[PDB]
Amino acid sequence: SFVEMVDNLRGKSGQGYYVEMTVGSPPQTLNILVDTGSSNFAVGAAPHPFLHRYYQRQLSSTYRDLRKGVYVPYKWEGELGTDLVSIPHGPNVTVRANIAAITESDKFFINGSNWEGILGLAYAEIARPDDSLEPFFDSLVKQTHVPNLFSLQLCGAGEVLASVGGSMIIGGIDHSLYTGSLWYTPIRREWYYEVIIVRVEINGQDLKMDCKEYNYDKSIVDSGTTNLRLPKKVFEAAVKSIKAASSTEKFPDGFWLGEQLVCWQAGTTPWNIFPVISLYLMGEVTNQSFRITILPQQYLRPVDCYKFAISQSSTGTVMGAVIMEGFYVVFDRARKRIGFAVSACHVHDEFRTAAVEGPFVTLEDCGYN
Ligand SMILES: NC1=NC(c2ccccc2)(c2ccccc2)C2=NCCCN12
Numbered sequence: 365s366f367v368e369m370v371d372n373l374r375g376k377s378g379q380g381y382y383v384e385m386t387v388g389s390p391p392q393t394l395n396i397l398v399d400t401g402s403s404n405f406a407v408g409a410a411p412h413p414f415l416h417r418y419y420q421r422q423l424s425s426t427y428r429d430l431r432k433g434v435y436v437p438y439k440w441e442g443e444l445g446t447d448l449v450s451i452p453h454g455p456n457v458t459v460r461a462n463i464a465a466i467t468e469s470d471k472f473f474i475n476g477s478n479w480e481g482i483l484g485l486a487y488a489e490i491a492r493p494d495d496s497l498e499p500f501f502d503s504l505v506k507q508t509h510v511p512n513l514f515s516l517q518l519c520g521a522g523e524v525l526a527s528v529g530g531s532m533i534i535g536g537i538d539h540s541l542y543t544g545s546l547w548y549t550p551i552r553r554e555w556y557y558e559v560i561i562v563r564v565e566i567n568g569q570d571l572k573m574d575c576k577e578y579n580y581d582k583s584i585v586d587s588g589t590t591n592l593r594l595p596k597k598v599f600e601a602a603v604k605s606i607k608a609a610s611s612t613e614k615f616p617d618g619f620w621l622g623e624q625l626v627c628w629q630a631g632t633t634p635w636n637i638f639p640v641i642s643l644y645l646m647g648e649v650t651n652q653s654f655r656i657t658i659l660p661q662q663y664l665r666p667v668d669c670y671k672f673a674i675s676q677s678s679t680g681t682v683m684g685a686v687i688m689e690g691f692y693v694v695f696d697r698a699r700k701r702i703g704f705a706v707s708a709c710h711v712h713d714e715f716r717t718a719a720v721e722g723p724f725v726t727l728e729d730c731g732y733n
Contacts, residue, residue, distance in 0.1 A: 366536060369455075369538070370531045371530070372454060373528075374395075374529060375478070375527070375529075376477055377520070377527070377665060377666060378665060378667075379474050379476070380398075380479065380587075380590070380685075381397070381398050382395040382398065382477075383395075383454065384452055385452070386449070386451075387419050387424070387447055387463060388425075388447045389424055389425045389448055392423065393417070394480045396479055396483045397483060397588060398532055399483060399484050399486075401484075401486060401589055402484035403485075403488060404436075404484040404491055404499070405449070405482070406466055406482045407463060408469075408481055409442060410465075414476075419463070419465055419481070427445055427447045429444075434493050440464075440472045443467060444463075444464055444497070446460050446462055449461045454534050455510050459504050459508060460503065460507065461504070464492075466481070482588070485500070485501055486556050487554040487555050488502060490556060501514070510535040511698065512697045513537070513695065514534045514535065514695050515537055515692060516692075517691075517692045517708070518530040518689045519707070519709035519710075520662075522711045526666050541692045541709075542705035542708060543705070543708060545705065545722075546694060546704065547645075547647070548648050548694075548699075548701040548702065549645035549647065549701065549704070550648060551697075551701055558583065559583050560575075560578075560645065560731055562575045562645065563644035563724075564578060565642045565644075566602060566605035566606060569605060571605070573601065576731075579680065579732050580595045582679075582681070582732065583681035583682075583683065584683065585688070585695075586683065587688060589684030590673060590684050590685045590686060591673045591675045592658075592663060592684060593681065594677055595680060596678065598681070599677070600676075602641070606620075606638065606674075609638065613637055621672075624671075625669040626669060635661060636713075641663065643658075645704070646730065647723060650728055651725055651727040652722070652723045652725060654723055654724065655721050656687070657718060658690045659712055659713075659716055661711040662687070663686050673686040689711075690710045690718035691704050691705060691710065691718065692704070692707045705720055706719060
């Protein structure tokens with residue numbers, strides 16, 4: 365029953381969402397980042413200044429060495445093996461999964477984030493060292509009767525970094541988690557969770573760009589990324605429009621670059637001054653699309669004071685947490701699609717709300733690749 369998976373996610377704002385997992389026998393408890401933007405189950409397996417716990421292979425009677433290392437610059441490196449893996453607040457099963465035991469790493473773990481490893485939920489194509497190393501979710505599906513699907517409701521927050529909650533529903537869709545209709549955009553290719561954006565508007569205003577720019581060189585849905593990340597040309601056009609809409613109030617360019625924080629005090633934030641942002645995603649039907657509309661409450665993340673959670677990308681559009689936090693997101697791997705619905709937990713004022721709305725007719729040459 366999915367009820368037992370509700371609120372199975374925790375995290376610190378900006379530091380990602382983690383689910384509790386156990387590895388080995390006896391079960392070693394670890395907090396593990398839910399990451400739809402990578403494909404390795406990788407866990408701290410040696411002391412680290414940011415690690416208070418780590419996977420200890422020698423303590424596990426069920427550990428099996430694959431005698432094969434992994435070096436992953438991008439860094440973390442480790443030793444491959446398999447072990448029994450469970451998710452206490454997830455499906456009631458245990459799986460023998462590939463585990464990359466991280467023995468050394470640079471700027472990989474985050475200080476104070478409270479997770480000790482990463483659960484790469486994307487596809488084998490991008491797994492390290494190569495695509496032969498079966499990803500956790502593939503193993504889970506193959507070894508159990510768990511349906512080939514999962515969904516994420518990331519809720520966010522709403523002196524110490526704010527705590528965020530959410531739910532990872534594995535093997536299905538929990539209707540209590542969203543309102544209205546689920547709209548689906550095709551997964552263009554099975555590596556990252558790649559999608560196509562066909563239009564974007566700021567406060568109703570079309571950016572009027574060739575839609576190839578929205579997906580240059582790709583667009584992906586990535587829970588392991590905090591920000592909405594946009595290709596250069598789109599970022600600039602987006603910031604311009606956002607600057608204009610919130611003109612009545614000047615902010616340092618350091619804020620727009622997402623380096624500096626801006627502050628008011630105790631519910632004086634002029635949300636209404638900032639525009640909503642609509643991303644139109646390719647629909648399941650050729651020239652049919654749908655939009656997800658996010659509020660400033662999503663793209664200004666709390667740090668009184670917030671940081672601009674829209675930033676520039678050189679590797680394509682990244683729809684990260686702040687985009688997902690508005691919605692219930694369905695990673696329908698079995699049907700190669702990703703659904704979006706308004707989340708039961710999304711943050712909104714008494715004038716606007718995050719929305720998922722369709723259809724809108726558009727007219728398929730938007731992918732780059
Ligand atoms: N999706 C995602 N996951 C990681 C990551 C997230 C958090 C901590 C450490 C690494 C990641 C994880 C494994 C391998 C490479 C990057 C990442 N790095 C920047 C782009 C977004 N991205």
